[PDB]
Structure formats: C-alpha cells, structure tokens
Paper text:
Phosphopantetheinyl transferases (PPTases) are essential enzymes involved in primary and secondary metabolite biosynthetic pathways. They catalyze the transfer of the 4ʹ‐phosphopantetheinyl (Ppant) moiety of coenzyme A (CoA) to a strictly conserved serine residue of carrier protein (CP) domains present in fatty acid synthases (FASs), polyketide synthases (PKSs) and non-ribosomal peptide synthetases (NRPSs). The covalent attachment of the 20 Å-long Ppant arm to CP domains allows tethering substrates and chemical intermediates through a reactive thioester bond and transferring them to the different catalytic centers of the synthases where enzymatic modifications can proceed. Owing to their role in activating enzymes essential for bacterial viability and pathogenicity, phosphopantetheinyl transferases represent novel and attractive drug targets.
Based on our previous studies, we have also been able to solve the 2.5 Å resolution X-ray structure of the complex formed between PptAb and its cognate ACP domain in the presence of CoA, Mn2+, and 8918. Since PptAb was incubated with 4 mM 8918 prior to mixing with ACP, the inhibitor does not prevent the ACP domain and PptAb from interacting. In fact, the ACP domain intervenes very little in the interface. Only the residue Trp2129 is involved in binding through van der Waals contact and, by sitting on top of the diethylphenyl moiety of 8918, causing the displacement of the inhibitor along its longitudinal axis by about 0.9 Å. Despite this, three of the four hydrogen bonds observed for the enzyme alone are preserved. The fact that the Ppant of CoA is perfectly ordered in the structure of the complex with PcpS, which is not the case for PptAb-CoA-8918 ± ACP complexes is in accordance with the finding that 8918 inhibits its target by displacing the Ppant arm, which decreases but does not abolish catalytic activity in the case of PptT11.
Residue numbers in the entry:
A (entry chain A): 4 to 221
B (entry chain B): 2071 to 2145
The structure:
C-alpha cells in the first residue's frame, strides 16, 4: 500500500487520503455553517478531508454522518469511534478507529521542507535542537520535529481535554521511521491512567511528511 | 486597543501574504491561518511588541479584536 497514512498505522484503523480537491465535493448541511464565511482554500480542505473521513468511517460500518468541531476545534467523532484528520498543501488525510481496540490516534501532514524562520526555536527544547543536529543529513529533521509534535497533541487532547505546549513534550526522532513522545507534564487521562510516553511513526514521500501516533488498549 | 488592532492586521497579512482588509471579529482560521502560520504570527508580535506572548493565546483569542484587547492587558 503506497498510501502515506496506511503505511504508519495498523490495518485495524481504516484511512483515506487525497492529494487534490476533486470537483463536485460538498459539505453536509450540518457542516456548512462551519465554513459559511471561510475563504476558498479553507473551504476546499475542509470538505475534502471530511470526504476521506466518511469513506474511512464506512469501512467501520459507520454511515454518512457530519463531523463537527468541539470547543478547541477537535473533531467530534461518533460514539465509540476515535479518529484524526490533517490537511496541508497537496494532502488531505483521515484515519478512524474503534475505541474497543485503540484509545486514541493522531496524524499530521507537512511539506518536506525547512521550517520558516524563527519557528524551530519556539517549538523545540534546547536538548531537541542538539539531537536534531546529530541526526543524519538529507532529511528536514526540524519540520519532522514540528509535525511529530502536532501528532503528539492530536493524540493527547482527546484523552485529556487539556492543553499541551511544545515545551511540554520531548520528541526523540529515529531515522528508521519511528519516534517517541516524552510528556514532561502530568498526563492525567479521563480514564484514570497516566500518559507519559507515546510511540509514533513517520514517513517522507511525495514531498510530504506524515507522522502518526496510535495508543494501545493495554 | 484600536491602535494595536490595526497593528496585528498588518502582521496578519504579512503571514497570510494578502492585502485585503480584515474584519476584526472574523476568526482567523476562516481566513486560512493554520498552526504553523499562528506560530509565525506569534513570533512577529513578540518582536514588534517586545513582550513574551504564549502561543496558546493566538487560538484562545481567535479574532483580531479578541487578540488586541488581550494583548494590552499584557502591557
Ligand atoms: O492543522 P492540520 O491541518 O495539521 O490538522 C488540522 C485538523 O486537526 C484537527 N484538530 C483541530 N484541533 C484539534 C484538537 N484540539 N485535538 C485534535 N484534533 C484537532 C481538525 O480536524 C483539523 O481539521 P479541521 O480544522 O478541518 O476540522
Ligand atoms: C505537543 C504540543 N504541540 C501542540 N500543542 N500543537 C498545536 O496545538 N497545534 C495547533 C494549534 C496551535 C498553533 C492550533 C490549531 C490546531 C493545532 C493542531 C491541532
Ligand atoms: Mn491544515
Ligand atoms: Mn498541522
């Protein structure tokens, strides 16, 4: 499977992705007021990514259902379903799962490119910038660090409903396509478990970085 | 807050790379601002205003007016 998301998450979690905005897509009526005043780019990426999500949802048996946004913008999934969506230029992706098998999932997409000026300093711990320099050349480790941190937050928030700052997570990137997220604050979950470390995966292809984190049922 | 509101609007069009006037009560996500652009904007406000501003405030106050008034209380 040459698909980015399907290559870094288990097959148990159906995923769907698109690299353009196919003509004729539209939002569900309950979703239109969410983008009723947004510009063309924000509208297209919103509609296309939710098409991928609903396609991945029907693999799990879930029929056509609107996907709205919560208080902090998180996607509001049907009861029992946990998912994640991401969209950047040239990519729209979505993955869903049942909480009977996975408790959370997060994915993030970024162009394989150096971060803009000044961003790496505000999102990386001093120990992280040193580790990124020691990594082998040929890979924009700075943005792989940024995108993996967004994935850390996207898996953290649905099990926590609390803020996680860039300074609150220590990410160690391994060149073999894996990475770990070490949470530096107290990770109280709504379940009662403490969340201290995440296991992640990443892939670079077609000028795109894609990071993904799946928590296990334990 | 009105003097700073138009000052954030100048910075927003610099990260958004546009030249259109911005309604001060329209959320910036509807204009195409994403997480990376919000970090860019935050660093440009920290420079222009010379004050340490946390990143979580850009989305706690998702409009220009919501951001401007929250910033003068940081003065
Ligand atoms: O910014 P990215 O495009 O990298 O990810 C965007 C997606 O993250 C998801 N997201 C936003 N806030 C989130 C949060 N607090 N927790 C989890 N996922 C979130 C949204 O689905 C968003 O897509 P939408 O804004 O079209 O709903
Ligand atoms: C490990 C810590 N990293 C994060 N907390 N990252 C985000 O919060 N990113 C983000 C933001 C903040 C700029 C706004 C809207 C949407 C997103 C991504 C869902
Ligand atoms: Mn996006
Ligand atoms: Mn992102």
């Amino acid at each position: 499977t040459d698909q980015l998301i399907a290559s870094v998450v288990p097959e148990l979690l159906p995923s769907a992705e698109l690299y353009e905005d196919p003509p004729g897509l539209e939002p569900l009526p309950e979703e239109e007021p969410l983008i009723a005043k947004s510009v063309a780019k924000r509208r297209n990426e919103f509609i296309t990514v939710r098409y991928c999500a609903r396609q991945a949802l029907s693999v799990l048996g879930i029929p056509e259902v609107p996907i709205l946004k919560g208080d902090k913008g998180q996607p509001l999934w049907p009861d029992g379903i946990v998912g994640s969506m991401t969209h950047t230029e040239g990519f729209r992706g979505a993955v869903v799962g049942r909480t009977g098998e996975v408790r959370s999932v997060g994915i993030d997409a970024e162009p394989h490119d150096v971060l803009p000026n000044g961003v790496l300093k505000s999102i990386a711990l001093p120990v992280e910038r040193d580790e990124l320099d020691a990594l082998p050349a040929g890979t924009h480790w700075d943005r792989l660090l940024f995108c993996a941190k967004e994935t850390t937050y996207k898996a953290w928030f649905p099990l926590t409903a609390r803020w996680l700052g860039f300074e609150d997570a220590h990410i160690t990137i391994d060149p073999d396509g894996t990475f770990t997220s070490r949470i530096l604050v107290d990770g109280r979950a709504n379940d009662g478990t403490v969340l201290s470390a995440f296991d992640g995966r990443w892939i670079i292809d077609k000028g795109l970085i894609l990071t993904a984190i799946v928590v296990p049922k334990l | 807050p009105g003097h700073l509101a138009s000052a954030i609007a100048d910075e927003i069009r610099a990260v958004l790379r546009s030249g259109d006037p911005i309604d001060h009560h329209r959320p910036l996500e509807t204009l195409g601002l994403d997480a990376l652009m919000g970090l860019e904007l935050r660093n440009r406000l920290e420079a222009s205003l010379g004050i340490t501003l946390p990143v979580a405030l850009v989305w706690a106050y998702p409009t220009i007016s919501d951001l401007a008034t929250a910033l003068c209380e940081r003065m």
